[PDB]
Design a protein around this ligand. Structure first.
Ligand SMILES: [Ca+2]
Lengths: 297, 298
């Protein structure tokens, strides 16, 4: 038995997208996945990676909420003009400051957002943008309480990182209060097709992020999977083939990532601090091979 | 290159031609077509009951990846109780819209070889399509093949969704198109007691194929269920209604994709290569194809 987090969440889920055509109109289009079943629920924000559509993350969202969670992932613009990620950083802040008056309005009947409990997470660049906002470089009316890093990336290399190079290369240097989790794709470093460079350059690799983390800080790595394997299966192949692609059921790791997340959030936004632990004690429960996996408190 | 059961080299794109597009589609349609231009055949996939075409995106992409412009009609609630006619007519309208409408939405440069048109359905969607083919309607474009994804005639032998295409008499189907019946071994299995089998017996892949007539082919994924081919981002709230296999769903999605991809290649290119091999040794398939029977005139 152990943890059913990896397993599908019993609560049913509903897919909601605001097209800026529903008052209060949002700062930008965001996809909202919330349990249709009534009851106050915690809320979380996911940041789409560059050249990626929130829709490509449907499976992860559905499962996460299915286990009891309200997830809102904005579809940032191509951000062509904005240098670095500043634009994305602010956009999320706007969404965050938009949730209070907009989430309740769009939320399905019976669903109330305990915004008091809010967490931020990002994939690749999206992860950079998030940690940035978490590092408080920008400003948000609400207050976060957890940070999940979906194999985050920082830039081409140390000499060249997105705005700003939050990385300091000093262990435990992140002055953040929200406990943080960093899931890693082992093959992220491994390159593929040659012409295409590593999607997860080292130095900017999730690894340096987890290192600069300050206890509390949790770390798990999907050894046999790729930077974009978690993306939904329907993922436009001409948009995913770039990164290395594990030789295994993308659905599996997708479920594994979902479980890792719910446990972390449950142990943060929520109150249960046992599922994540059991995982930490016996990662074998995971569908995939989580290695390495270490904890700092 | 025997690269079947695997992604096609052609990059694909998804376009949801809405009623607000011109020519306006008779009914909303999701068209997944190769991004690169060239002569691409056309095929129509009809979704099952209480299902959305978005749920078939993966399979659609894999097939299309093998150079196939696919049209996915998004049927709407049928007011007529026990009536597939509304959907049958909607599918037919989609066919006549294909000529003028499809090249206007296709990636600029991509062009459809309508001459080679194919029709496919899922569950009640399969009933819908088999009906059109049998000729319950008349489409100016003449389709050239019929595929049934675990066809579902209706509730039971005494309760078939009208039109009752089933005759229970072998090779009664008076159609001149090659027919492919991909079934699921778990479709006839109930679930939760309260949920009756999604592919009821006496109206499942077992008879559907029998009434089919040469050329006629039959393949069954013993390891998967009725909806297991739907995408993994499925609502679940609905997907769970049907028995779910324990094997990787994505495995079946590609398995069905290949079986279909080949059948299409065999009837529209007479390559009769991947298909012959699959029929020769189902092992090549990632999943477990059983039973597998083919009745070619010669
Ligand atoms: Ca999808």
């Amino acid at each position: 038995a152990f943890t059913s987090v990896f397993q599908p969440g019993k609560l049913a889920v509903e897919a909601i997208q605001v097209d800026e055509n529903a008052a209060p109109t949002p700062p930008i289009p965001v996809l909202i996945v919330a349990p249709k079943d009534a009851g106050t629920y915690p809320v979380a924000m996911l940041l789409h990676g560059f050249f990626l559509h929130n829709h490509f993350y449907e499976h992860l969202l559905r499962h996460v909420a299915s286990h009891g969670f309200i997830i809102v992932a904005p579809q940032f613009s191509i951000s062509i003009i904005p240098s670095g990620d500043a634009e994305d950083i602010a956009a999320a802040a706007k969404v965050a400051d938009w949730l209070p008056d907009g989430l309740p309005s769009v939320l399905p009947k019976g669903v109330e957002p305990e915004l008091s409990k809010l967490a931020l997470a990002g994939h690749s660049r999206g992860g950079h943008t998030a940690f940035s906002l978490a590092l408080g470089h920008a400003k948000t009316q609400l207050t976060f309480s957890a940070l999940i890093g979906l194999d985050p990336v920082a830039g081409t290399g140390k000499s060249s990182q997105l705005q700003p190079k939050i990385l300091t290369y000093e262990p435990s240097s992140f002055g953040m209060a929200m406990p943080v989790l960093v899931i890693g794709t082992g093959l992220g470093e491994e390159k593929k097709n040659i012409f295409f460079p590593p999607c997860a350059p080292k130095d900017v690799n999730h690894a340096e992020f987890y290192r600069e983390c300050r206890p509390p800080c949790y770390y798990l790595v999907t050894k046999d999977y790729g930077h974009l394997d978690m993306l939904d299966d329907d993922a436009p192949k001409f948009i995913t083939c770039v990164c290395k692609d594990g030789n295994g059921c993308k659905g599996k790791m997708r479920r594994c990532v979902a479980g890792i997340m719910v446990a972390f959030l449950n142990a943060a936004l929520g109150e249960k601090d046992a599922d994540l632990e059991a995982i930490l004690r016996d990662p074998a429960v995971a569908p995939t091979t989580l290695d390495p996996v270490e904890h700092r408190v």
